[PDB]
Design a protein around this ligand. Structure first.
Ligand SMILES: *[C@@H]1O[C@H](CO)[C@@H](O[C@@H]2O[C@H](CO)[C@@H](O[C@H]3O[C@H](CO)[C@@H](O)[C@H](O[C@H]4O[C@H](CO)[C@@H](O)[C@H](O)[C@@H]4O)[C@@H]3O)[C@H](O)[C@H]2NC(C)=O)[C@H](O)[C@H]1NC(C)=O
Ligand SMILES: c1ccc(CNc2c3c(nc4ccccc24)CCCC3)cc1
Ligand SMILES: c1ccc(CNc2c3c(nc4ccccc24)CCCC3)cc1
Ligand SMILES: *[C@@H]1O[C@H](CO)[C@@H](O)[C@H](O)[C@H]1NC(C)=O
Ligand SMILES: *[C@@H]1O[C@H](CO)[C@@H](O)[C@H](O)[C@H]1NC(C)=O
Ligand SMILES: [Cl-]
Ligand SMILES: [Cl-]
Lengths: 537, 537
C-alpha cells in the first residue's frame, strides 16, 4: 500500500490527508511498549512485541487512566481538556505526522501537559496536521503514564531486591522510550534522526526539560521549546520522602496494609496490582493538599532525576543547546478560579474585599514564612482602580508569577549562563472566541492552538489578525526546529541572557513594541532576588 | 502720632505701608524678652523691661546667632535663606502687621523653620505685607533662639539646685513667651485675642505642633497650620540622653572640662557663658552625624515635652482643634543634594549607577536594620525610564517620604482620630523662576511664597497662572484662620481622616483632579504600616 511504513517493530499503515494544499500521512496508535498491566503496572516500560501483518494506524489511541474534570458540567471550555478516547491502562502508543541538511526532514515531538495527573496526545488541540503540512516537517506525539500509574514511588521503603517494583518516574521513562523509538524510526518516516526538537507545555514543557537534562537521556536531543513549564517550578518536582509518604497513603487508601510494605513487599504490591484502576485513579487525589501541589510529579530518585532541579546545572555546559521558552500573561487565573471556586465565577469578575484578599493570599502562601507572606502581600496590594476587581487580579498575578513565569525566567537565566542559546517569548493575546470570563485574561495553555497553527484552519472561527498571529507563531516553531533560532530574517529577536533579558511579545496589537526587557524583570526580581533574602531570618 | 500703639510694655511707633490698595501699619523689632546674654545665656527667657519713650519699630531686628550656608558661594538661591540682618545673641524681638465675631481682627502668628539651627523672621520671603492687606488680618512673627543657644540641655548631668542652668528647649520657651505676648497685646493692635492661628514650615511647623500640644501652653491656641513639619518626624525630636551627650561634647569642644560638669557645675557653665558666641555657633556643628539629624531639636525634658511625640495623643481629645497641614512634591531633593554633594549637582541631573545607589541608600538608612535597609532599597528600585536619572529621583523620594511626607501623613491620621478637624494639601507646582536644577523639582519650602501671597506682588516675576495660584493659596490660609476651614464656598475640600485620606492638590495645571486619595496612601503605607512589621525580627 502507498501508506504502509516499515518500522523497527513491524509494518503499519496510516491514512492520508490534504491540509493547506499538501499531502500528509497520518499514523496514529502505534505501540511503543508492552501494555503496562498485570505485573507490569507501576514498573518501567518494556519495548513492545514485534508484530507481523500491517498494523492499523488510522484510529485514535486510548488515553491513560485519569479522572474527568467536571467542575463546570457540560461547559465546553473545561471538557475540551478531558479525554476524548476511552481511558485504559493499555495506553502506550505513538502518533506520527509525515509529509508526502540533506539526509531527511526535521522531527518535532510533542509532550502534552496536565499536571502529571491528566492529559492526552489525542486532543484535537494537539492535531499536528497543519503544522506538518505548512512546516514541511515531521511531528510526533505519544501517551505517557500519568498519576500514580506513572509516579508511584516506593523503592526506598523496600529492600533493594524489590527496587524495580515501583521505582517512580516511570512516566518519564515512557517518554524516554517513545523518544528513543522515534529516533530509531526517524529515517523510516522521511525524518533525519539527528534533527529532533522536543516541545511541550506546562507538565509537558517540564518533561521536555527533564528529557533534555536527565543523565539517562542527556545527549539525544539538544533543542527544545518549553512553554510555561520548567523543572525548577514548585509543582514540577518532589522529594523522594514526600513521594514515599504520598505513595504509602495511596496504599492505605486502597486497603493494602502499607504498614506491611517493609517486611512483606511482594504481598503489598500484589494487592496494589489487583485493585481496579478506577480506584487508584480516584484515591490518588486524597493527597491533593493545596493549590498547584499535585500528588504526582518528577521525583528525585537518583536515577532519572539524580538531584534537585537547581543542582543539575552547577556542572554541565550547554554550548550546543537551542532553547525556546516563554509564558502567557495570566498563567494563574485558571488555577485560582479552581482552587477557590467558592469565591470566584468563571464568567464574572469578583469584587474581593481586603479581608478576603488576606484570607486567600495567606492560604496560597501558608507554608512560607510569615515575613515572606507579609512581603508577598505587600508586593501585591492594590492602590489604583476600583479595589475589588483589582484584588482578584493581583492574586492571579501572584499565583502565575510565583508558580510559572518567574520559575521560567530563572531557568532561562540559568541556561544562558551555561552557554545555551535561549530565546524568550511572552504571549499576550486574548483569543476572540475564548469561552472563559474576561477577568481570567490570557489563560494558561491559550497559546498552544497558535503554536500549532490552528488559526490557519479556515473552518475554525478566528479574526484575520488571529490567523496572522497563528501563522507567525507557527513559523517561530518551524524556524526554531529548523535552525535553532525562532527569528525570521528581517525580524529582530535577540538572545535572552541575564545581562540582556529581552523577550518577544506575541500579540495581535500592532501598536506595541514587541521587544521588551523591563516589566518581566521587575515582577520576577521580587521572586528571584528579593524574597530569597527575607527567608534568611 | 498716628502710628504709636500702647503695648503692655510701653509705647511703640511703626511705619505705614499701602499694599494692594490697603493701609497696613508695620511694627518691627519690638522686644518681648530681656536680651539673653551674660548669665542669661542658655536659660529660659525672661519678660522684657518695660520702657518709657516711644520705641522705634521701623527697623528690622537682629537675627539669632547662626552660621551662613555657603555651599554655593554667591549663588542667590542659597543666600536668600541666610540672615539678612546682623547676627546677635540680642535677638528676641517681635514683628506685627496690622491693618488700618465683632471684638477684633484675627491674628496669625508665623514661626520660621531652618532645622532648629538657623532661620529668621526678617527674611523678605516672610514679609506679611500682602497677607495682612489682602487678608484684612493681623500677622505677627518673632525670632526664637536656635542652635545650642536654644537647645543646650544639661540638667540631668547636674544636681537639681542647678536645674535652670541649661534646661533645654529654651527656644520653645521663647516662642511660648512671644505667643503669650501677642495674646496679651492682641486687643491693642485691633486683634481678637481669642482668634489666633499659628502657622509655620519645617521646624517652624514642628514648633507649631509643639506650641499646640505642650502642657505648658496647651489651650491658648487650638487652630494651626503645619507645612511639612510634625514633631513625630525623626529630625524633630531627641532624647534627653542624646542631648546630654551632644551637649557635653560642645562643652569639651569649647575647652570647658565637661568631665567637671557633675562635681562643679557652676564653674563649667561660667566657662560656657564666657565663650564668644561665634565659637559656640561653629563648634555645635561637630555633632552633625548624618543627613537630617541636627544636633539641636525639641528634647524630651519632662517639662515642655513631657514624653515622646507619639505618646502625647494616646490621651487628649481634640474636638476643638482646627488643623491645616500638607507637604511638597520633592521634600527630600534639597537635603540629598547637600549631604551627598560629592555625587550631585545643583544644576544638572546625575545618572547614578546601581552600585552607587546602594552605596547612598545604605548610607542614609545605615542605622536601620538591614532587613529594613533591604526593604527600602527594593521599594525604591527603578525599572522604567532611563535608569540613571531615576536612581537619583528615587533616593530623593525615599528621603522626602521617610523624613517629611509620611511622618506628616501619620500625624494627620492621628489627629483626626482624636477629633481634630484636619484638612490636608499637597503642593506640586514648580515655580517658573526657580533657580535650582530641574531634577530637584518642587523644593522644600517652595510653597511658603505662595501661602504668603507673594505672587500677588506685581514687581516680582510670576506667570499669570502663578499669580492665580498664589491668590488661591493665600485665601486657603485666610479662610482657615477665619473659620477653621480652608475651603472656599463652592469649593470641595473635605476633611482628612484615616477612613478617607483625601487631600487637595495645589497646582497650576488645571487638567488634573485636585482631590486625591490613592498616591500618598500607597507611598506612605510602606513607611507607616509595612516597615513597622519588618522591624519585628
Ligand atoms: C514686592 O516686591 C518688591 C521687589 O522684591 C519689594 O521691594 C523691595 O522692598 C523692600 C522694602 O520696601 C526694599 O528694602 C530695603 O532696601 C531699601 C533700599 O535699599 C531700603 O530703603 C529699606 O529700608 C528702610 O527700612 C529699614 C528697615 O530695615 C528702616 O530701618 C529705615 O527707616 C529705611 O528707611 C530696606 O532696607 C527692597 O530694596 C525692595 N527691592 C526692590 C527690588 O524693589 C516689595 O517690598 C515687595 N512687597 C510689596 C508688598 O510690594
Ligand atoms: C493540571 C493542569 C491542568 C488541568 C486541567 N486541564 C487543562 C489543561 C490546559 N488548559 C486548561 C484550560 C482550562 C481548563 C483546563 C485546562 C492546558 C494543557 C494542560 C491541561 C489539570 C491539572
Ligand atoms: C535645615 C533646613 C534648611 C536649611 C537651609 N535653609 C533653607 C530653608 C528653606 N528652604 C531652603 C531652600 C534651599 C536652600 C536652603 C533652604 C525653607 C525654610 C527653612 C530654611 C538648613 C537646615
Ligand atoms: C469505548 O467505549 C465503550 C466503553 O464504555 C467500549 O465498549 C467501546 O468498545 C470502546 N471503544 C473503543 C474503540 O475502544
Ligand atoms: C551691622 O554691621 C556691622 C557689623 O559688621 C555693625 O557695625 C553695624 O552697626 C550693624 N548694624 C546694625 C543696624 O546693627
Ligand atoms: Cl508548494
Ligand atoms: Cl476695599
Amino acid at each position: 500500500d502507498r501508506l504502509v511504513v516499515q518500522t523497527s517493530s513491524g509494518p503499519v499503515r496510516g491514512r492520508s490527508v490534504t491540509v493547506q494544499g499538501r499531502e500528509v500521512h497520518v499514523y496514529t496508535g502505534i505501540p511503543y511498549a508492552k501494555p503496562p498491566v498485570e505485573d507490569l503496572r507501576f514498573r518501567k516500560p518494556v519495548p513492545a512485541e514485534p508484530w507481523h501483518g500491517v498494523l492499523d494506524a488510522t484510529g485514535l489511541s486510548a488515553t491513560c487512566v485519569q479522572e474527568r474534570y467536571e467542575y463546570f458540567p457540560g461547559f465546553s471550555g473545561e471538557e475540551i481538556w478531558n479525554p476524548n478516547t476511552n481511558v485504559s491502562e493499555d495506553c502506550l502508543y505513538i502518533n506520527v505526522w509525515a509529509p508526502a541538511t540533506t539526509n531527511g526532514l526535521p522531527i518535532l515531538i510533542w509532550i502534552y501537559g496536565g499536571g502529571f495527573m491528566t492529559g492526552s496526545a489525542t486532543l484535537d488541540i494537539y492535531n499536528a496536521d497543519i503544522m506538518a503540512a505548512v512546516g514541511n516537517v515531521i511531528v510526533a506525539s505519544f501517551q505517557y503514564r500519568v498519576g500514580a500509574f506513572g509516579f508511584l514511588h516506593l523503592a526506598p521503603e523496600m529492600p533493594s531486591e524489590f527496587a524495580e517494583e515501583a521505582p517512580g518516574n516511570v512516566g518519564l521513562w515512557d517518554q524516554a522510550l517513545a523518544i528513543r523509538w522515534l529516533k530509531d524510526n526517524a529515517h523510516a518516516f522521511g525524518g533525519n534522526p539527528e534533527w529532533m526538537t522536543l516541545f511541550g507545555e506546562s507538565a509537558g514543557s517540564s518533561s521536555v526539560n527533564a528529557q533534555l537534562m536527565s543523565p539517562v537521556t542527556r545527549g539525544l536531543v539538544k533543542r527544545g521549546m518549553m512553554q510555561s513549564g520548567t523543572m525548577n517550578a514548585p509543582w514540577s518536582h518532589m522529594t523522594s520522602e514526600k513521594a514515599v509518604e504520598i505513595g504509602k497513603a495511596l496504599i492505605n487508601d486502597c486497603n493494602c496494609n502499607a504498614s506491611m510494605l517493609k517486611t512483606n513487599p511482594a504481598h503489598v504490591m500484589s494487592c496494589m496490582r489487583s485493585v481496579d484502576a478506577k480506584t487508584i485513579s480516584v484515591q490518588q487525589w486524597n493527597s491533593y493538599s493545596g493549590i498547584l501541589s499535585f500528588p504526582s510529579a518528577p521525583t528525585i530518585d537518583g536515577a532519572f532525576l539524580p538531584a534537585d532541579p537547581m543542582t543539575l546545572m552547577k556542572t554541565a555546559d550547554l554550548k550546543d543547546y537551542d532553547i525556546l521558552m516563554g509564558n502567557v500573561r495570566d498563567e494563574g487565573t485558571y488555577f485560582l478560579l479552581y482552587d477557590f471556586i467558592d469565591y470566584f465565577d468563571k464568567d464574572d469578575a469578583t469584587a474581593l474585599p481586603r479581608d478576603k484578599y488576606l484570607e486567600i493570599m495567606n492560604n496560597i502562601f501558608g507554608k512560607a514564612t510569615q515575613a515572606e507572606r507579609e512581603a508577598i502581600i505587600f508586593q501585591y496590594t492594590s492602590w489604583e482602580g476600583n479595589p475589588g476587581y483589582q484584588n482578584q487580579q493581583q492574586i492571579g498575578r501572584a499565583v502565575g508569577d510565583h508558580f510559572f513565569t518567574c520559575p521560567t525566567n530563572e531557568y532561562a537565566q540559568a541556561l544562558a549562563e551555561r552557554g545555551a542559546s535561549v530565546h524568550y517569548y511572552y504571549f499576550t493575546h486574548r483569543t476572540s472566541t475564548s469561552l472563559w470570563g474576561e477577568w481570567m485574561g490570557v489563560l494558561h495553555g491559550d497559546e498552544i492552538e497558535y503554536f500549532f497553527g490552528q488559526p490557519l484552519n479556515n473552518s475554525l472561527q478566528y479574526r484575520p489578525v488571529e490567523r496572522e498571529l497563528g501563522k507567525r507563531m507557527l513559523s517561530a516553531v518551524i524556524e526554531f526546529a529548523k535552525t535553532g533560532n525562532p527569528a525570521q530574517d528581517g525580524e529582530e529577536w535577540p538572545n535572552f541572557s541575564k545581562e540582556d533579558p529581552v523577550y518577544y511579545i506575541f500579540s495581535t496589537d500592532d501598536k506595541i513594541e514587541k521587544l521588551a526587557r523591563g516589566p518581566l524583570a521587575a515582577r520576577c526580581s521580587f521572586w528571584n532576588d528579593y524574597l530569597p533574602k527575607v527567608r534568611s531570618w
